[PDB]
């Protein structure tokens, strides 16, 4: 019950219905309290404050919001759905046909070096994505 | 006049005067933010290996007691002011005393224990170069 309430308050915070992130010593440790959301180019981003910057974070998407295709520049990417549903289009460094993927909660897609990808919220609710570089 | 004015306002900024900074692999001086750590002001350039090149700003007669060059050898070059540096070798018990003025440099090998004290009643600035 206690863990269920802590889990839900983190999810609601990631989904944007909260006044403060789950509040929490060791620098190796990046607690949930470091998930401050910044709106950049119309999309909400929250990253853990870690030794290498911006390696693990969350993307909060508004209803049906899409992020135009971008390229995986210096680091490979993994996108794992924290909440909601996403439509992902992937285009490798070659071929003209783009691959289309539907990801619901718990699904993960691997985006390799150089691949161009786009993300769209597939539903009329806030959807949350975890980005792993 | 332009180059001499830009050099002067960089020095004053590093010394904590002015309030205004000097407006990929390039880390420019206007991007130098000073952070207070353990009571001493540090500003580092953005490098691939973090915190390899920076500035140490000392308050009047402020001292940082001895620490050891653990994982990286370092060079201390005086950007402004006067410093007293004490050095301690691995097994040596007697510390050697050095006075460094602007432009002076001391090399601290790995494992050497060293201390730094601002020698004057003004802000003194040190450049730390780790390898």
């Amino acid at each position: 019950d206690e863990q269920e309430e802590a889990s839900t308050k983190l999810m609601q915070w990631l989904r944007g219905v909260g006044d403060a992130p789950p509040s929490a010593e060791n620098a190796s440790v990046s607690s949930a309290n470091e998930l401050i959301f910044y709106q950049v180019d119309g999309i909400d981003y929250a990253f853990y404050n870690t030794k290498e910057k911006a390696m693990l974070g969350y993307m909060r998407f508004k209803p049906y919001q899409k992020r135009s295709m971008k390229q995986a520049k210096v680091h490979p990417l993994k996108l794992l759905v924290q909440f909601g549903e996403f439509n992902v289009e992937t285009l490798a460094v070659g071929e003209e046909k783009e691959v289309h993927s539907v990801l619901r909660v718990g699904d993960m897609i691997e985006i390799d070096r150089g691949t161009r990808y786009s993300i769209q919220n597939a539903i009329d609710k806030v959807s949350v994505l975890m980005c792993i570089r | 006049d332009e180059q001499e004015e830009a050099s002067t306002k960089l020095m004053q900024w590093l010394r904590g005067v002015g309030d205004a900074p000097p407006s990929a692999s390039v880390s420019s001086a206007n991007e130098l933010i000073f952070y207070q750590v353990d009571g001493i002001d540090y500003a580092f350039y953005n490098t691939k290996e973090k915190a390899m090149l920076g500035y140490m700003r000392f308050k009047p007669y402020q001292k940082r007691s001895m620490k050891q060059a653990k994982v990286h050898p370092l060079k201390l070059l005086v950007q402004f002011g006067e410093f007293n540096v004490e050095t301690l070798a691995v097994g040596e018990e007697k510390e050697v005393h050095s006075v460094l003025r602007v432009g002076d440099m001391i090399e601290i090998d790995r494992g050497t224990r060293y201390s730094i004290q601002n020698a004057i009643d003004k802000v003194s600035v040190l450049m730390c170069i780790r390898s």
């Binding site: 709106q39 030794k51 | 973090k50």
Partner: peptide, 24 residues
């Protein structure tokens, strides 16, 4: 609420306030 260069600085400041004491 922020620009991409602005997020870079905000992440940069937050990174330094936490990890600088381990590089001195």
């Amino acid at each position: 609420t922020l620009t991409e260069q602005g997020l870079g600085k905000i992440i940069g400041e937050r990174w330094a306030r936490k990890y600088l004491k381990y590089h001195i």
